[PDB]
Design a binder for this molecule. Structure first.
Ligand code: MET
Lengths: 147, 147
C-alpha cells in the first residue's frame, strides 16, 4: 500500500529532509496541500519515523566508535537489555541478531579510556558479556535506498 | 571551538531535522537571523552533513537486514573494497573495523533469498569472503548524543 507519488516523496525526503512542501509539490506534480496531507499520512503510518540532522560525531567529540555485541549472563532472565540500555546516552543503536550473540550495539565515546568505562556500565546494566569491535573509519553510512 | 550555543542547535536539529529556523531561536535564546547564520556555518565547517527523513525499511520492502563482515581474499591487490562496493545500492553503510574481518557492511534486502544473491555479488565485485549476521529487530537506531 505505497503508490508512485509516495515513492517520490520518501525518496526526496531521504535525500533532503529540510526540503519544503512547495519543492516537494512541484516535484510530485501536486498542490502544496495534497503534499502536506500525504506527508502526514506517511508519518502517521510508520513510513517516516522522524527527521534528523546528520551530525559529524568527530566534530562533537566522539572520536572512538564501536560495535558491541552483547549476550545475557543468564539467558533465562526475561529479555530486557534493549529497555535497560536505552538510557545510556552513548548507545546509538541496538539490534537483536541471529547467531552466538543476542544484540549488537553501536556505541560512541570520547576515547579508549571512556570506552572501558562504558563497557563496564553495559556489562552491569544489562548483565551481559560484551564483544567489542572498534571502528577505524566510516566510508559512508545511512545511505537509504528506496527501490 | 564549538560554542555551546552551537551544541543546543545540534541537540535540537538532531532530534528534529525540520525544526524551523523560527521555533529554533525561542528554544535557543537568539534572533531569527543570528540562529539561521551559524546553521549555515555549521554546515559549512562539516558538522551537519545533511538532513534526512528516517525511512522505515520494512515499509519500503526491505524485510531482511544483515551486517555483513568482509575480508579481501588476496592481500597482494590494492584493498579498495569500499570503492568497489559503493555502486551496489543495497549497501547502506561500510566501516573498516579492528576485529576478525576488515570491514562491516549494513545491507538491506527483500528476503533471505535476495541476500544470497547480494552476497555472491559482493564476493565477485570486491574480492572478498563474506560472513553475515541477520538482524531480527531494530529497537532503536541513530539516537545521536551531543555531550
Ligand atoms: C535477540 S534473540 C537472540 C537470538 C539468538 N542469538 C539466536 O540465534 O537464537
Amino acid at each position: 500500500a505505497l503508490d508512485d507519488i509516495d515513492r517520490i516523496l520518501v525518496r526526496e525526503l531521504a535525500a533532503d529532509g529540510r526540503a519544503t512542501l512547495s519543492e516537494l509539490a512541484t516535484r510530485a506534480g501536486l498542490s502544496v496541500s495534497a503534499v502536506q496531507s500525504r506527508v502526514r499520512r506517511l508519518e502517521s503510518r510508520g513510513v517516516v519515523q522522524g527527521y534528523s540532522a546528520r551530525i559529524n560525531p568527530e566534530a562533537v567529540g566522539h572520536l572512538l566508535s564501536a560495535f558491541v555485541a552483547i549476550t545475557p549472563l543468564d539467558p533465562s532472565q526475561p529479555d530486557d537489555a534493549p529497555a535497560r540500555l536505552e538510557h545510556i546516552e552513548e548507545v546509538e543503536s541496538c539490534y537483536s541478531v541471529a547467531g552466538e550473540e543476542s544484540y549488537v550495539l553501536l556505541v560512541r565515546v570520547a576515547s579508549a579510556r571512556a570506552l572501558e568505562d562504558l563497557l563496564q556500565r553495559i556489562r552491569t546494566t544489562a548483565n551481559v558479556r560484551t564483544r567489542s569491535t572498534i571502528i577505524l573509519n566510516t566510508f559512508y553510512s545511512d545511505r537509504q535506498h528506496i527501490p
